[model samples]
Target: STPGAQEVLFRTGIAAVNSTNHLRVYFQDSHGSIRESLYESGWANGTAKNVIAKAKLGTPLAATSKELKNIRVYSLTEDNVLQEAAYDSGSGWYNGALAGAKFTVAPYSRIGSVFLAGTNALQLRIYAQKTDNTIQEYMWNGDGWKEGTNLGVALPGTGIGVTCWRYTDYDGPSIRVWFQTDNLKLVQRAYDPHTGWYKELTTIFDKAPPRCAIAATNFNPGKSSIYMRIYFVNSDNTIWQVCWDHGQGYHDKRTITPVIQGSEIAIISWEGPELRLYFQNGTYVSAISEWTWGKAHGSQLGRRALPPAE
Candidate 1:
């Protein structure tokens, strides 16, 4: 699904064991207009792999909006795909975070709906950083960009320690932004609208945690549970992870580990086999591995973090 029209390419989800095989392609316009195509490719089990399609935009977007807007005019066919579309837009990129800079870009797992703000504007609840600095939660009004939504601000100094999933299980999307501040406090801030300002309601690891470089995701669809992998400096200053799965509510304080070590930002979605994590060792580690939540969650995962080659 690109910007203007939403196009979905589907497969039979069946396997073809012989050479002369064909898979049917289905098309549905946003207005319930349907079309079909034939894909004749022999040579595989019927598992719908390698079957891809793209939809072209009938017309490019006229302009950026000043309100929260839906960029994809075509609706996603699958429920989870739709959810991910929205989630992906909100959480933009996570890299290039400078001390005290606005580094709000993040990842998402869903796209709920798009709405307009002013007369000709569309706003987005997605989070992102324009460059290496300047993080933002903006609305894409049908016309332009506006800072209507806000992820929590990273305190001065102390690079980002851990930012778990943007918990989408609540009324609004709440993001967990963890970073060491100039005060030397390793904090986890839950950014939500309180008193017309995005505020951090919960601060876990009020003190330094046991690891650096962490990752997180939610399992159990529509459930309030968060699985986290924390990478931090141990008392001896060694990097490791304190991972665990916690019920999705504001607890006083807590600590646990489910995955350990390595500098990897992980994300998992109920959407397919999307349990992915990228591990970096000395900025050159190979491979990686490896959770749910709610609210009106939307984000952009790939662009929300530091450059992967780091």
Candidate 2:
């Protein structure tokens, strides 16, 4: 059976065979193996098929993307080390090897990755959680991997959140890293290629639900340049959201629902031009439900039930 997972859609071309939507889902199986499924058509009504590679004894944290002619997947290895596997359009899947970046502490909890502009090449930044509850990052600039550097902050659980966005006129993409601290406070750190990591960490909310999952997305409203909406479960077992736009900086919280609990949260802008949030219910046998937050011009969408978990 599959545990909590993250779903992403990589527009085909770079390394995917066809120009179809590649809906990839990554999760940890019951045996602790990190597994992935790819659906060529899309996940809405398409059947998901397994990928060529899987990591043994790895965490549920996994990331996948297409860069140039390569489709890459990153995860923590059995030994709490970072590893990468790639697929070349012409060669299929290759290069399943340790990426040379090891977590000094054995149990690296969560992992994340984002694409950014390197000095001379497009780089992929990988973020992982060490056993000591801190975040360590590594970089791969098309050619080779770099050393892991500690980001100097402690997180409470494996609920690590990551997303990247390029400002209106910024030189490179900015990566936002979010995690809950020991006290269940949602905190964040921002990174920029040219200027490096931000000096101060921003506290997004006072108290999030312990080990609550987080999902984020960025979009531009009518008069707004770029607004970021972050979704997470609060301590009271309710779904809440906070937004940050050019004008208001960061707005207060808004409640979404009171039904979700203890499930990995996933957010995606669907093909229907709507933002959808997915999560499992808290029952013994759970079901996956989706709630849409409308599109750029529509009103707020409501919750809709989906098929039960397999």
Candidate 3:
């Protein structure tokens, strides 16, 4: 036993007693060198290896002695890696060569709501399932363990950046995606067990930003189009808006603010009265419902737009 575990043996000068199959010994020497060796019948000789230090065994383990095969052991490496080693070969405690895992997360990385997929199938979550058969789920705070949104069994693959909205059209479900990569693009994927594989609905957005952004996937009767508002920031820092009615095809991008003049922009529906514009310039702008895009509409940090009633 290393240090804390019960010692399974007793030594009394001439002889010893023991009954442990696996012995964890902690060896420390002044030279800092360690090795293993064995002695043979009637001859006192070092076999195959050297003895930095060791113990002479006296007893063998009985057949009835239990063995811990599938075990979970964890170690934090000096390189800042968390390694969950498997001591149980049968129980799948080890991350095999393939990392034994289909999902993982870099520390401090956050995965938000599982968009598009239903609340039953996709919601807010982070997950990891290893090959050796270990599954971990992280929540908003990751304080407690919870069952993962079995997306693979339900939707398959992975679900990310999920946001769902009900449309006046009452068609089905609409959503937008956002992540650390191209995953920000909005996509529709539907799967039916009888149909076999999942079919992507349509490429809602062709160009997605390299960072966080938002999109109102459905047509907001509240806007000019009252149909579809595909909003995004182009590579040129232009706030682009393209809308489509039931019949009309893709509309030419309506550039709201010119080239943003070296500044980027992101727009979110203001639950408040006025139209709120959160800019990359650290300016928060608001406009009354009827305030023309003229001087009446100005940008101020933490300002709210007045509603029509106000």
Candidate 4:
């Protein structure tokens, strides 16, 4: 066993640990090294990774697991080169430069990735904000790394969130990307194999407060699902989520009562579709709170401040 999270530099990331649906939370420790804590029935001690000196202090971290296979965590170095530190079941950890560091990202850019069970097989896709505010993508089909067409510009310095659904009509999953724009409005874009990415972005919310943090995911595979949910903090610090359902499509925001210490938040589609949202709570000393399904609770972090890595 390791020790509890000392203090995180910025945002925290969560991934479905494997096919059994256990979870692993990822964060940059006080040393700016990537670390993780596993969640079986409870949270475990956070452990460090080989990404020790490679990441920028508080760099945005994105995590995804290839089902029963490996877990990959992505972050950028102080030089702005994106790096991948991956862990395999029997092989332990390995690190490498993504795209040979071909794409230099904006300082403190937001990183987002999702493991999609595509039509034929599983695929890992990553999205990052570039210096020009453009959202660029990278792919891992089987083994090698490659780039995708630029997704487009977003609100500079904004947090990014992604979710996908394997809608029956499409040959592959239809992935949705969300980010804020100049007016503080949250917008959405879609990408599928048949259509690639949309030229026109859709407005999901027209009144997001400035400096807001966001997280999103296609909800529970349990039953008739909500389809998708986009989460963010309201100006009052209360948590709000925009939902998309089958017939109603996108609708107004639903408020979840728990107020948090900071704006940065992350979401995970947990066991059998249960959802959890993580953030620092409003208590005097910040503790990482988890809103499991609907009940609000937390994990302690000493006095460690977790700044936004988004």
Question: What are the TM-scores, per candidate, against the unseen true structure?
Answer: 0.36, 0.74, 0.33, 0.83
Predicted structure with the largest TM-score when compared to the true one: 4
Model 3 clashing residue pairs (backbone)? 69-88, 70-88, 71-88, 100-131, 114-123, 115-162, 219-227
Give the alpha carbon lDDT tens digit for every residue of 188-229 in model 4. 988876878888889988887765777887754423333787
lDDT of each: 0.29, 0.56, 0.28, 0.66
Clashes of 4: 1
**Which of 3 and 4 is ahead in TM-score?**
4
- Tens digits of per-residue lDDT, candidate 1, 1-310, equal 2321222211101000111122222222233322222234421211223212222211010011112222222112221111111211476312211212222332211111123212232233433322233334444444543455444444322233323233345444334444544344565545433433345434445555322333333333333555544444433333334444566443333322232232323232333313322222221122111111223332112211111111
- 279-306 in candidate 3: lDDT tens per residue? 2321222111111122344432432211
Q: Which is better, 1 or 2, measured by TM-score?
A: 2
Model number with the top lDDT = 4
Q: How do the candidates rank by TM-score, highest first?
A: 4, 2, 1, 3
Error of 1 at 17 (Å): 30
Model 1 Cα shift for residue 91 (angstroms): 21
Worst 10 residues of 3 by lDDT: 10-19
Residue 8 displacement in candidate 3 (angstroms): 63
Any idea what lDDT model 3 has?
0.28
